[PDB]
Amino acid sequence: MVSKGEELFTGVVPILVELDGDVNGHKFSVSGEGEGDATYGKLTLKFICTTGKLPVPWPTLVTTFVTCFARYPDHMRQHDFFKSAMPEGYVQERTIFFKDDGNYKTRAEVKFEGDTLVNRIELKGIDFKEDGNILGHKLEYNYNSHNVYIMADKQKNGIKANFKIRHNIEDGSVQLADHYQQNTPIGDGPVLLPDNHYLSYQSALSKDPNEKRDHMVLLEFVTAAGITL
Ligand SMILES: [Br-]
Ligand SMILES: [Br-]
Numbered sequence: 001m002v003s004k005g006e007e008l009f010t011g012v013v014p015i016l017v018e019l020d021g022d023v024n025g026h027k028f029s030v031s032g033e034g035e036g037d038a039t040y041g042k043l044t045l046k047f048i049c050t051t052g053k054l055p056v057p058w059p060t061l062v063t064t065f066v067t068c069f070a071r072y073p074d075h076m077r078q079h080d081f082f083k084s085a086m087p088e089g090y091v092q093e094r095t096i097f098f099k100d101d102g103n104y105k106t107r108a109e110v111k112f113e114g115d116t117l118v119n120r121i122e123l124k125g126i127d128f129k130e131d132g133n134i135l136g137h138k139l140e141y142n143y144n145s146h147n148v149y150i151m152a153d154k155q156k157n158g159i160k161a162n163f164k165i166r167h168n169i170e171d172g173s174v175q176l177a178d179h180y181q182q183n184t185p186i187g188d189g190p191v192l193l194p195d196n197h198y199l200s201y202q203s204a205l206s207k208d209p210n211e212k213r214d215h216m217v218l219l220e221f222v223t224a225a226g227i228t229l
C-alpha cells in the first residue's frame with residue numbers, strides 16, 4: 001500500500017525555501033522556488049538573495065537549501081523517514097564546520113503549507129576568517145557528488161548523519177565542510193526509523209542569464225541505496 005506520506009510525493013510538488021542568515025554579523029536573506037519530483041529524486045530550484053549581495057559563496061548553502069524528495073527504490077521504502085513525517089514535517093538541524101575556518105549552525109523546518117513543500121531555515125555563522133575561503137569568496141561555483149550515510153537516531157525518534165563536503169578551490173585544493181546532522185519529527189505521529197543506508201547526491205549549479213540579482217540555480221538528484229549485498 002501507498003503510505004500517507006508517500007502519496008504526498010507521487011507527482012511534481014512545488015517547493016518554497018526561505019532562509020534568514022547571519023554570518024560573522026553579516027545579515028542576509030534568501031528565497032527559493034522550484035519543484036521536486038520524488039519519483040526521479042529530482043530537485044530544481046532557483047534562489048535569490050533578497051538583501052543584495054550574498055556574503056558567503058552560494059555553494060556553501062547547497063546542503064542547507066528537502067530530503068523528502070529523495071528517490072527511495074521500491075525495496076528501500078521502509079527506510080524513508082523523510083516522507084513518513086509528512087505532512088506535519090520534520091526539523092533538520094546541522095552544524096557545518098569549515099576546516100580552518102568558521103562554522104554554520106542551521107535549523108530548518110520542512111513541512112507542507114497547503115500543496116507547497118516549505119523549507120524554512122535560520123542559519124548562524126561564527127568565527128569565519130574575513131579573508132578565508134568563505135568570506136573571501138574563494139570557492140569555485142560548482143559542486144561534487146557525495147554519498148551520505150543515514151543512521152537511525154532512536155533516542156531522538158529520528159535520523160542523524162555526518163558527512164564531509166568538498167568545495168573545490170582553483171588552486172587545486174578543497175575547502176572541507178564537515179556536516180553533523182539531526183532530524184526529528186514535528187508531529188507526534190508515527191515515522192519510519194530506517195536501517196543504515198546511503199543517499200547518493202549529484203548537484204549542478206548554474207545561473208539564469210536574464211537574472212541581475214545575486215542568485216543560484218540548482219539541479220540536484222538524490223537516490224537512496226541499501227546495504228544488502
Ligand atoms: Br558572530
Ligand atoms: Br528581490
Ligand SMILES: [Br-]
Nearest residue numbers: 057058059141
Ligand atoms: Br558564489
Ligand SMILES: [Br-]
Nearest residue numbers: 066067068222
Ligand atoms: Br535533499
Ligand SMILES: [Br-]
Nearest residue numbers: 092094106108
Ligand atoms: Br538544516
